[PDB]
Amino acid sequence: ATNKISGGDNNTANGTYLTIGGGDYNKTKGRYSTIGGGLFNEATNEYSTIGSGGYNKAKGRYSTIGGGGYNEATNQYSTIGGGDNNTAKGRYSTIGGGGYNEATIENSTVGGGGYNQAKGRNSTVAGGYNNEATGTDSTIAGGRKNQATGKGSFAAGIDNKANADNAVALGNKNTIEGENSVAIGSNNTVKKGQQNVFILGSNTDTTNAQNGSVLLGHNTAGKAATIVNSAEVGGLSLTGFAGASKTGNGTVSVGKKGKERQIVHVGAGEISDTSTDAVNGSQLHALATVVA
Amino acid sequence: ATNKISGGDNNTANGTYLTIGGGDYNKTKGRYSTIGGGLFNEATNEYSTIGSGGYNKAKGRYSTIGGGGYNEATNQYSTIGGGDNNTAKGRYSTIGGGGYNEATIENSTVGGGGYNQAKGRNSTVAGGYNNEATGTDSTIAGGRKNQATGKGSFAAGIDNKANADNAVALGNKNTIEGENSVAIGSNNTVKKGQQNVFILGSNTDTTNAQNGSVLLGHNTAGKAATIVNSAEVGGLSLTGFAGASKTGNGTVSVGKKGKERQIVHVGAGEISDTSTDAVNGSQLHALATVVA
Amino acid sequence: ATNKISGGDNNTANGTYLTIGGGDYNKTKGRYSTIGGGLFNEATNEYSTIGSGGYNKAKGRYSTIGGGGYNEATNQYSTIGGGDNNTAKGRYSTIGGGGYNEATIENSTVGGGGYNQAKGRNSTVAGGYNNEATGTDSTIAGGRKNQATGKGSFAAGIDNKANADNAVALGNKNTIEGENSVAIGSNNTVKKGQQNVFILGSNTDTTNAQNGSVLLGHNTAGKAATIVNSAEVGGLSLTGFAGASKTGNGTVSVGKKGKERQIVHVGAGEISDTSTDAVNGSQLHALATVVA
């Protein structure tokens, strides 16, 4: 006799200090739970809340469904703002609204949009469509058809995969499955076992890119690092080159075979036997002048 | 006689299983709609919800307004968490809260903040102020005065325009209106018809940057690619250069005229007639040594 | 006698057109405020709203708390969707849900997650864990333990500090405290007084990087710019170098001492006395051929 249920013949209460504002076929269980009205809403557990709408289920302690239809807030401190067929079943999980979204682990959030999944702990999908953040601390800023399965990974745009730890995939069709790698632009792939690779470009060819490679530009291809201590030009040998690195660091690429790029506005580099500064045309000219 | 309306003399119901918790001047229409209380709230259609507040309008099926004032949730599965003068009129559209925000198409989302507009399908504005995402699958992460009119474009910071397809504008005053281009930093412009341009820099001059150009650094200027098959130094001709590309790929720029940059820690490149590897100072020194 | 309070012996109303749907120990003050039910909820001021739950406080005009526990919406047009111990005390501030989140200034937003703080005007934290956006127009896209104290700054991933104006920190452990700088990758530091520095790389050494420096790649180190007008190789002097810039622009770095990187697919640059185009191996070979 502590409950305030009113409205319909089929509104049922099974507990203490429950309230149903009206509508019909609404169930309440537990203690201090509330349904504002609507149709076929279930608010069980302690201190749960359903604003209204239809076929919503707020099981779990301190759950909240603002309204809409077919939403399910399960688990402690869940929140669904509203929308269609949203499922917040993580602790402190949040779905702002939209359709068919899932926030399934502790502190996961979905801002809205459609068919988004925040499945990682502390993962976030701000909005967009068909985005899937699975890694711990992963983020999808928005867009469509992104994946962020990496720990603390970040993805935004269309069809990206930030699918290794600390992966950054920005733009369109960037696939990252190698640790600590970045791809910004379009159509870029960093495969598993290609580590520390950085791409600011589009339509790159990363077949031959070793670990540590940097790729810049449209149509740029990776290349294996070669050790060059010396060279021979028709009997004449040139020895003592600096930067003939033993380690496999990879190479900074600015184009591909047949589609090379000029590097412009380069300052004059040191000319000495230990110098690893790049050389510009005026410096080579200077020497060629003497060869007259 | 299936309705539960109570509270004020001016609360009106026109339908089946409607509920008004209290307050005054609240209207309900349709079936299974609910107003918790407050003032001048309109909940029409089937299964709509208004928590409370004032002058809110939840027309449209399965609409939800949590509270606040002057909010309008129109169209199926709309959600407004609360706030001032928010308009969610897209299907499954969402506005978390804030003031004067608009989510107008299917699956669009506004997290909060002020004067934000998610007008593209699957578009997202997480928050901030005066941000406008118009493209399909476009994203504005936050900040102030951003635009994302491009399909699957991405913008964040202050005063950016990701206004071409797959455009990435990050930081302050990056304007992109050329396809598949990226600008990260400050004060960068990629105009319409400048395609595949990548800028990691600030205050760049892109007047002379052709398609495919890469600009790195503060004050960096673009430059037109030149074909250089050979050169002549005082009667002496040097022929057979590799990388004298016929195609217009653009050029990687690291500075501007008068403010050139050295490129440092460059590994020794191949010295052969097909070599497109960059050359360091020790390599030029090596040859100069022989010229003694 | 304009109020509709029902449910418990300890539900109190002190104002006009207030409503309490049920539960117990709920307080209402002001005009047109509403509590759906629950336990120990306080809805004061004009047009405030509490859906239900426990120990929630909606002071402030047009406030909204959807549900959950221990939430406090203070100040005009505040919104808390639900969750645990959230505090929205800015004008038009928004918290989607989650636990222990704070939106404290005008137009600030927290999408969800845990221990997030939007303390800057127009600031946004989409979600994640322990993120702190303090700057005006600052953004944290998501992830864990980020800071964005800079005006219009942007951070995402794990443990970043976008802590200067227009700072972009993307990935893991990027620290930016220098004006208009960008760090994308892992373990990068831009200190106060290092301006206009751009890093696309990881584990960089920025001790010797001057203003305007660009660092590319894993393990890349900055280097001070040197003026090189001429050089001397065993009595032979080479004068008239172009790009011997007087200004301190900094240098583009591609590696570090002992771990240098080759730059590959470089187009042939102009060979003239004003040429600042980079030189490739085939061009140096061409000259070496003549030295036979």
Automatic annotation (TrEMBL), chains A, B, C:
Compartments in which it is found: Cell outer membrane; Cell surface
Trimeric autotransporter adhesin YadA-like stalk domain sequence ranges: 262-292
Coiled-coil portions: none
Membrane-spanning segments: none
Family: Belongs to the autotransporter-2 (AT-2) (TC 1.B.40) family.
Protein name: UspA1
Organism: Moraxella catarrhalis
Lineage, uppermost ranks: Bacteria, Pseudomonadati, Pseudomonadota, Gammaproteobacteria, Moraxellales
